[PDB]
Automatic annotation (TrEMBL), chain A:
<protein>
    <recommendedName>
        <fullName>NADH dehydrogenase [ubiquinone] 1 alpha subcomplex subunit 12</fullName>
    </recommendedName>
</protein>
<comment type="function">
    <text>Accessory subunit of the mitochondrial membrane respiratory chain NADH dehydrogenase (Complex I), that is believed not to be involved in catalysis. Complex I functions in the transfer of electrons from NADH to the respiratory chain. The immediate electron acceptor for the enzyme is believed to be ubiquinone.</text>
</comment>
<comment type="similarity">
    <text>Belongs to the complex I NDUFA12 subunit family.</text>
</comment>
<comment type="subunit">
    <text>Complex I is composed of 45 different subunits.</text>
</comment>
UniProtKB/TrEMBL annotation, chain B:
<keyword id="KW-0249">Electron transport</keyword>
<keyword id="KW-0472">Membrane</keyword>
<feature type="binding site">
    <location>
        <position position="82"/>
    </location>
    <ligand>
        <name>Zn(2+)</name>
    </ligand>
</feature>
<keyword id="KW-0813">Transport</keyword>
<comment type="similarity">
    <text>Belongs to the complex I NDUFS6 subunit family.</text>
</comment>
<dbReference type="GO" id="GO:0022904">
    <property type="term" value="P:respiratory electron transport chain"/>
</dbReference>
<dbReference type="GO" id="GO:0045271">
    <property type="term" value="C:respiratory chain complex I"/>
</dbReference>
Automatic annotation (TrEMBL), chain F:
<dbReference type="InterPro" id="IPR045299">
    <property type="entry name" value="Complex1_LYR_NDUFA6_LYRM6"/>
</dbReference>
<dbReference type="InterPro" id="IPR008011">
    <property type="entry name" value="Complex1_LYR_dom"/>
</dbReference>
<protein>
    <recommendedName>
        <fullName>NADH dehydrogenase [ubiquinone] 1 alpha subcomplex subunit 6</fullName>
    </recommendedName>
</protein>
<comment type="function">
    <text>Accessory subunit of the mitochondrial membrane respiratory chain NADH dehydrogenase (Complex I), that is believed to be not involved in catalysis. Required for proper complex I assembly. Complex I functions in the transfer of electrons from NADH to the respiratory chain. The immediate electron acceptor for the enzyme is believed to be ubiquinone.</text>
</comment>
<keyword id="KW-0249">Electron transport</keyword>
<dbReference type="GO" id="GO:0045271">
    <property type="term" value="C:respiratory chain complex I"/>
</dbReference>
<keyword id="KW-0472">Membrane</keyword>
Length: 67, 89, 683, 205, 61, 115
């Protein structure tokens, strides 16, 4: 209560709520369901569990390592 | 927290002496749990009879461009787009 | 002789009668499309793209190999020419795989650009749905190449390059018709010091750089002109830099030096700038360990060791050092009262004053016009491979006959070995041997001497003997004396005034010693006294840096701007395409800062003032890309057998420290030894 | 027919050809070369000293009533001896047409202002003052119009870099918006999109 | 007027880039993997490459 | 060599020198109205010293068209300072009050960074 926002709607009901499709996901047999599809998450900004970026490539110049 | 010391699928992790782990005291590190390598070697290879086979991603127009793989060489032949493996007995 | 008139695109032009349609077209400016015509290879008619319509002819002619006659009107922009080009390359593109996003040649592929210009807009190939296009298996040609034979268009450039320039005939054309595959019949490795150029010569990119595997894209690449320093040819290259990282080394066309050709060691050593680098200044603390310190503390430690030396100071120049660091090192040693400097590769005594004793006096572009050459203990296939390409071109075209002195070597062409004794080196200079009569009867003779015989003392007299024979072989605008060096710093150091003896600094017995990019391993700690202080200035950690009491990190040849002088004497300057990593800086800046910390500063604070100081040294080092003709070169022969250091490919791969640091050369050596051990297991 | 290829207008080509020869006959001193480009547009390349009368002629002749001056465009070509070129685009409502009058200007050579003829140029040449840096003599008000008040240099000159030379931030020990040397967080990745094979054989002559 | 005209104070360039940068006039190198010479057909001015670095946040140049 | 060009507001060097001295006089009169109005932390004498330094770094030019272009640009800055037409952030840009100075000796430049 008093914490509702627009990010609580999952991916299957998002097109039904935004009038993209007239088919609810109860009878929408075309929507896939794979093993790697994660559950829906809200916007976690302003929270200790937010996103913060980083470099994905590792170090490309290696030093000596005298020993 | 184990997400700071977790390694991504590109082989990247910050060291314990690095100053760049100070950015993760207030926001958690995002590491994708679904590595593409494990989910592409979980798919078994497809046994085929013809000398050449065609791959299109398994979706038609929604997959990759259609390419032809030769199967006369023994072993597993990997499609360079989707990673599906073909084999001829 | 006379010039015949041909009307190309309704434009009259006077051409030599031996020229073809495409040469006259390139003379007036129009570029006729091609896939198999390379001007350094033999002509062929297999790609059929260059079809042009000449007047009063029933069929179009191939412009690459049809010689012109008087009165022809060639129409490049005709309707029949464009129809023929569109049909021919539609046939080229009916069986090409849809591999453009996973193809490393894409963005600079000839087939993509020749479809956007003089190509059709849509594919007429209905049969993609059923009984579709072909696919052929990949052949493990080598560890340097990545072969996807489905993308090959059968243009026969790689086979002509192997059988014409590379020398070995491992590549071939198997099969007949639509199932023809351009590859080796068995699982073999194609090995040449020139396989990287095959990636250059493949127009579609079926043959791909395997160290440059999916790394970047050609529109993204910042291209910077540089000169490779690992070989002594001084070949002009272009370096691919994107987002402050080296990607690959590609040839840049200089007709005098390299002519679109690059060695495998010069090309596939871009990984060596990434591994075993030096990023921090290191000082050997008295507990026995080399620890990384700050720049100012390392500089004052080297200054305190210099002040504790008190007159016994010597310095050794290496193989990767440029002209400017050698000038700064010699200026620092001469300002500190030390008259001894050293170079790693040795030389004869008294040959410093005249350039012709250490110069490839015949031009590398002129060596293709030689009629008979003599090799005195050198292997130019591995020591300086573009000189071997020039000798192969002169062997193919100018009917060159070549005799060699030393052990049995493969020069990628037919040659006769006279022997291994040095006394017959006198005999060719005496006139008793028949090859002396061959050299005297030749129109443009030459004698090529390796530098490792000039490292020897008594063979130095051999040098003088060859000079006497050059007084019997002098020709107008042709100097027969030739000395083929190994590293790119020896000629520059002898131009400055270095004593090229590496044992000279050991015999001087200094208290502090300067190693400037030296990794040859000629100096150890047991030769030096116990109070020595070895200072390393170079960029790569190796056996030169393993014996150093103070390690100062430098920049590589792609990270600094520096003049290098090759064997022929052409001084060329590299360009800083990528910033140095860590706390590494330019070497002459390290020497100037050391002069500031010690107390006697060098008079130059900028690079242009250092070029002015080089002008004060010698005016020919200031001008770049211009070679002045040197003068004439100016006796107990020892009984030692003549030996060559580079006799095989595995010795050629680990010549230099940058080539030592890279894992590509280790992969090549492992693949070569694996192929040899499988051959020995099968036999 | 050819549905992909654009069909031109023959009567507009004939009318602009006759009017271009008429303009080249009327002013032999200032008109340097009259050309008719593809797309049925007439370009009258003129001398710099004829910048003010020719437009006046094109304002005031009975077969040249180019009442509107829609814009003035400057093109920076550094390879030429006279660097900038200045393109006046004029619209005629009476004869329902357009003309382009092109002149060349050095970095220091003036241009006589067309504000006595067309008042819209009262700002338009100001833009050419700000973007390129050519002085317009007899201008009622010549100032920088689009750039910063403390800006140095001219932006759309090709010698000027894309990202400029300086940046602005906020500084608390001075309590002011301050000027700093330019450092991008990520540099502008230059793409090499030059064509290696020529496509148009009609433009090499 | 003399034809040798210095326009450094007019162009708005800072003086440090005037006294420090070196300008290379060159014909651009042909791509060795491509037979086309249309991009070779011009000369061009380019400026000397200074230091690039990695930003500590995310890893750009 | 020799070249015949159209002049900008002056024929010879003496008129351009007179225009530069007119700029110096007008900027001298405009400085005390700049100081009291713009809310800047610069004393009037520091402003006049900065004006002198701005003229000193352009004393070296000799060409009259370059001098007159500098006169035109200085007149534009004067017109942007008579009417206020600006803020205090742009007036202080001449002093470069935010840039920390860099050393000129080679040892400190070697220690700090490659620039
Ligand atoms: C409070 C804010 C202060 C703002 C200061 C900035 C004002 C703008 C500064 C300028 O206008 S820079 C351009 C000045 N123009 C010139 O210097 C023209 C060339 N100067 C000369 O030739 C000089 O030799 C003089 C100025 C003639 C001095 O020569 P004397 O010796 O015969
Ligand atoms: S060879 Fe050329 S056309 Fe074929 S897939 Fe590669 S980039 Fe595309
Ligand atoms: S592999 Fe490349 S170079 Fe060799 S024939 Fe095929 S397309 Fe030509
Ligand atoms: S270029 Fe003439 S047939 Fe290939
Ligand atoms: Zn696939």
């Amino acid at each position: 209560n008093m914490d509702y926002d627009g990010s609580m709607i999952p991916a299957e009901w998002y097109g039904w709520m935004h009038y993209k499709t007239d088919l609810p996901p109860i009878r929408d047999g075309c929507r896939p369901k794979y093993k790697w599809i994660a559950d829906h998450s809200e916007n976690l900004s302003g929270t200790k569990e937010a996103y913060y970026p980083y470099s994905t490539t590792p170090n490309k110049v290696e030093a000596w390592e005298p020993k | 927290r184990g997400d700071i010391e977790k390694v991504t699928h590109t082989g990247q992790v910050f060291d314990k002496e690095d100053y760049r782990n100070a950015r993760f005291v207030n926001a958690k590190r995002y590491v994708n749990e679904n590595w593409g390598i494990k989910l592409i070697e979980e798919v078994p290879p497809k046994e085929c009879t013809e000398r050449v086979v065609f791959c299109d991603g398994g979706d038609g127009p929604l997959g990759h461009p259609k390419v032809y793989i030769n199967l006369d060489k023994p072993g597993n032949h990997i499609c360079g787009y989707c990673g599906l493996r073909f084999v001829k007995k | 002789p006379e010039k015949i008139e041909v009307f190309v695109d309704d434009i009259p032009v006077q051409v030599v009668p031996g020229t073809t349609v495409l040469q006259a077209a390139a003379q007036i400016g129009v570029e006729i499309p091609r896939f198999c015509y390379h001007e350094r290879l033999a002509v062929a008619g297999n790609c059929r793209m260059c079809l042009v319509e000449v007047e009063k002819s029933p069929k179009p002619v191939a412009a690459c190999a049809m010689p012109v006659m008087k009165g022809w009107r060639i129409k490049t922009n005709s309707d029949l020419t464009r129809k023929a080009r569109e049909g021919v390359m539609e046939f080229l593109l009916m069986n090409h795989p849809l591999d453009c996003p996973i193809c490393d040649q894409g963005g600079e592929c000839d087939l993509q650009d020749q479809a956007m210009a003089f190509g059709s807009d849509r594919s007429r190939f209905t049969d993609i749905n059923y009984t579709g296009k072909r696919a052929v298996e990949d052949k493990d040609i080598g560890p340097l190449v990545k072969t996807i034979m489905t993308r090959c268009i059968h243009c026969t450039r790689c086979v002509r390059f192997a059988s014409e320039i590379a020398g070995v005939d491992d590549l071939g054309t198997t099969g007949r018709g639509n199932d023809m595959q351009i590859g080796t019949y068995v699982e073999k490795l194609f090995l040449t010091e020139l396989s990287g150029n095959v990636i250059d010569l493949c127009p579609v990119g079926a043959l791909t750089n395997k160290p440059y595997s999916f790394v970047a894209r050609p529109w993204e690449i910042r291209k910077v002109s540089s000169i490779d320093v690992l070989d002594a040819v001084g070949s002009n290259i272009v370096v691919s830099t994107r987002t402050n990282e080296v990607l690959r080394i590609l040839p840049r066309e200089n007709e005098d030096v390299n002519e679109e050709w690059l060695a495998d060691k010069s090309r596939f050593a871009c990984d060596g700038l990434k591994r075993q680098r030096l990023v921090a200044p290191m000082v050997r603390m008295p507990n026995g360990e080399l620890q990384a310190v700050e720049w100012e503390g390392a500089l004052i430690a080297v200054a305190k060791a210099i002040k504790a030396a008190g007159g016994q100071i010597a310095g050794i120049s290496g193989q990767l050092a440029d002209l400017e660091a050698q000038v700064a090192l010699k200026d620092l040693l001469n300002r500190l009262g030390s008259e001894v400097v050293a170079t790693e590769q040795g030389f004869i005594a008294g040959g410093t004053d005249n350039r012709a004793n250490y110069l490839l006096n015949s031009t590398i572009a002129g060596l293709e016009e030689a009629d008979a050459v003599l090799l005195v203990g050198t292997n130019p296939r591995y020591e300086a491979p573009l000189v071997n390409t020039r000798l192969r071109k002169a062997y193919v075209h100018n009917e060159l006959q070549i005799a060699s002195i030393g052990p049995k070597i493969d020069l990628s062409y037919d040659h006769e070995n006279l022997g291994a004794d040095a006394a017959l080196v006198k005999d060719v200079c005496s006139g008793a041997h028949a090859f002396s009569k061959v050299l005297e009867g030749a129109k443009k003779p030459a004698i090529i001497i390796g530098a490792d015989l000039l490292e020897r003392a008594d063979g130095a007299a051999i040098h003088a003997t060859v000079a006497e024979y050059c007084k019997k072989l002098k020709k107008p605008n042709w100097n027969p004396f030739n000395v083929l060096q190994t590293n790119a710093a020896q000629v520059g150091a002898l131009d400055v005034g270095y004593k090229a003896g590496a044992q000279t600094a050991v015999k001087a017995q200094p208290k502090v010693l300067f190693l400037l990019n030296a990794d040859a391993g000629k100096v150890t700690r047991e030769q030096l006294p116990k109070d020595c202080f070895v200072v390393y200035i170079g960029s790569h950690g190796d056996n030169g840096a393993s014996i150093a009491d103070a390690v100062l990190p430098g920049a590589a040849y792609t990270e600094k701007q520096g003049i290098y002088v090759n064997t022929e004497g052409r001084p060329q300057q590299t360009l800083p395409g990528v910033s140095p990593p860590g706390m590494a800086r330019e070497d002459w800046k390290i020497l100037r800062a050391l002069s500031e910390v010690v107390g006697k500063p060098l008079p130059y604070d900028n690079l242009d003032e250092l070029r002015n100081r080089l002008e004060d040294v010698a005016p020919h080092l200031t001008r770049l890309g211009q070679l002045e003709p040197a003068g004439d070169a100016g006796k107990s022969i020892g009984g030692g057998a003549i030996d060559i250091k580079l006799k095989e490919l595995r010795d050629y791969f680990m010549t230099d420290a940058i080539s030592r640091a890279s894992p590509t050369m280790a992969k090549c050596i492992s693949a070569v030894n694996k192929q040899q051990r499988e051959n020995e297991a099968k036999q | 027919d050819k549905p992909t290829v654009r069909q031109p207008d023959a009567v507009a080509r004939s009318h602009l050809s006759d009017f271009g020869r008429y303009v080249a006959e009327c002013l032999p001193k200032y008109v340097q070369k009259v050309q008719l480009t593809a797309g049925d547009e007439l370009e009258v390349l003129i001398a710099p000293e004829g910048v003010v009368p020719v437009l006046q002629f094109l304002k005031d002749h009975h077969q040249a009533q180019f009442t509107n001056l829609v814009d003035i465009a400057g093109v920076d070509v550094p390879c030429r001896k006279n660097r900038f070129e200045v393109v006046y685009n004029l619209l005629s409502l009476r004869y329902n047409s357009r003309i382009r009058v092109k002149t060349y200007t050095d970095e220091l050579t003036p241009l006589d202002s067309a504000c006595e003829v067309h008042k819209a140029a009262n700002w338009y040449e100001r833009e050419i003052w700000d973007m390129y840096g050519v002085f317009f003599a007899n201008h009622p008000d010549l100032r920088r119009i689009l750039t910063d008040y403390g800006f140095e240099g001219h932006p759309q000159r090709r010698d000027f870099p894309l990202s400029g030379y300086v940046e602005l931030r906020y500084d608390d020990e001075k309590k002011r918006v301050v000027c700093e040397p330019l450092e991008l967080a990520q540099e502008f990745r230059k793409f090499d999109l030059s064509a290696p094979w020529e496509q148009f054989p009609n433009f090499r002559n | 007027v003399p034809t040798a005209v210095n326009l450094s104070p007019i162009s708005g360039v800072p003086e440090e880039h005037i006294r420090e940068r070196r300008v290379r006039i060159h014909i651009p190198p042909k791509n060795a993997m491509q037979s086309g010479t249309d991009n070779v057909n011009t000369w061009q001015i380019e400026f000397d490459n200074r230091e690039r670095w990695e930003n500590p946040l995310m890893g750009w140049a | 060599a020799v070249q015949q060009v159209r002049p900008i507001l002056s024929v010879d060097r003496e008129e351009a020198r007179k225009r530069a001295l007119n700029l110096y006089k007008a900027w001298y009169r405009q400085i005390p109205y700049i100081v009291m109005d713009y809310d800047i932390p610069m004393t009037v004498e520091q402003c006049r010293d900065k004006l002198r330094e701005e003229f000193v770094k352009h004393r070296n030019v000799t060409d009259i068209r370059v001098i007159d272009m500098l006169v035109i640009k200085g007149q534009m800055e004067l017109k942007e300072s008579v009417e206020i037409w600006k803020q205090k952030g742009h007036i202080m840009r001449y002093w470069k009050e935010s840039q920390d100075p860099k050393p000129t000796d080679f040892l400190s430049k070697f220690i700090q960074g490659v620039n």
